[PDB]
């Protein structure tokens, strides 16, 4: 109805995990034309969940200082990367992102300050917003360290990892590394 970046309406997209229906904000109440809005989200907590994930995917993309406030420069990175996605697949690219949000967010990790077995010891669960935060952080990081010495564009290297993570193959960085979290959480489970 609102057609994020002018096309690809957000009616067909379906969030499969009930654990993340309150936290991924693709639906029509929180569906915009393009991911740019004056935020005001770290005034009070738990309103960064009704911030749309395309806004949170393009805010977590400007990272390493040299490209740090360049938000109109990363809003075209996501704009083309949906369009690379639709050519390799033929899916509404909002759906293949929200599969990668499910598939890359972990389920176990660990915390101790004391007598560190491997890194952290008491293996704890995860709240279902940190697994979204560590979904997009795992996607944006892994798309980035795999285009630092590469002829490949950061636009395609973004696209070619999250459809590689939405399918789930340990071939993207967001899948092959998240398993090391749950492995080492099993190693001190």
């Amino acid at each position: 109805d609102i057609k994020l970046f002018g096309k690809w309406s957000t009616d067909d997209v379906q969030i499969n995990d009930i654990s993340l229906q309150d936290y991924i904000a693709v639906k029509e109440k929180y569906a915009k034309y393009l991911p740019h809005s004056a935020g005001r989200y770290a005034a009070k907590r738990f309103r960064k969940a009704q911030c749309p994930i395309v806004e949170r995917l393009t805010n977590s993309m400007m990272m390493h200082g040299r490209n740090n406030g360049k938000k109109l420069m990363t809003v075209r990175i996501v704009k083309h990367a949906f369009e690379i996605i639709h050519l390799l697949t033929g899916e509404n690219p909002l759906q293949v992102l929200v599969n990668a949000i499910i598939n890359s967010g972990p389920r176990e990790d660990s915390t101790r300050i004391g007598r560190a077995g491997t890194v952290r010891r008491q293996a704890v669960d995860v709240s279902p917003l940190r697994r979204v935060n560590q979904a997009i952080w795992l996607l944006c990081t892994g798309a980035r360290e795999a285009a630092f010495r590469n002829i490949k564009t950061i636009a395609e290297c973004l696209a070619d990892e999250l459809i590689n993570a939405a399918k789930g193959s340990s071939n993207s960085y967001a899948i092959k590394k998240k398993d090391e979290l749950e492995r080492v959480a099993k190693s001190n489970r």
Partner: protein, 146 residues
């Protein structure tokens, strides 16, 4: 030629950090431009949908009896397109409380409030000065001990 309906118009401003944009809008026939040039012909164009966004979810042919034109002063390239987005939203909102019923104004404010309230409320946050001990407003120079 002032022969019919003299000065049936409003002039409404909207603001961004270090910016303003006051939209003069008369009675007329579907004409919108910013500093002379049209709305689809604006400079950034990556943010093209969110300055013709009050056109989109309101309706072109429906609300084309008005001849909005905007002058913009101060700020920067992103703050001056949120300025005209806020302005011409609340320009024709302020135009309908004066020349038609507010039954239509509440009918169009109903769209523009469930859809991201900032179109006719001013974003209050501003520059927030630097202090005398750091390179920025909160940050400080690197403390050394040895």
């Amino acid at each position: 030629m002032p022969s019919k309906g003299p000065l049936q118009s409003v002039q409404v401003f909207g603001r961004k950090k270090t910016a303003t944009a006051v939209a003069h809008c008369k009675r007329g026939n579907g004409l919108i431009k910013v500093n002379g040039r049209p709305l689809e012909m604006i400079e950034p164009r990556t943010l093209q949908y969110k300055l013709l966004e009050p056109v989109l979810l309101l309706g072109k042919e429906r609300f084309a009896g008005v001849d909005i034109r905007v002058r913009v002063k101060g700020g920067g390239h992103v703050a001056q397109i949120y300025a005209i987005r806020q302005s011409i939203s609340k320009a024709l909102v302020a135009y309908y409380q004066k020349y038609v019923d507010e039954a239509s104004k509440k009918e169009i404010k109903d769209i523009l409030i469930q859809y991201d309230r900032t179109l006719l409320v001013a974003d209050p946050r501003r520059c927030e000065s630097k202090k005398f001990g750091g390179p920025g407003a909160r940050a400080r120079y690197q403390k050394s001990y040895r």
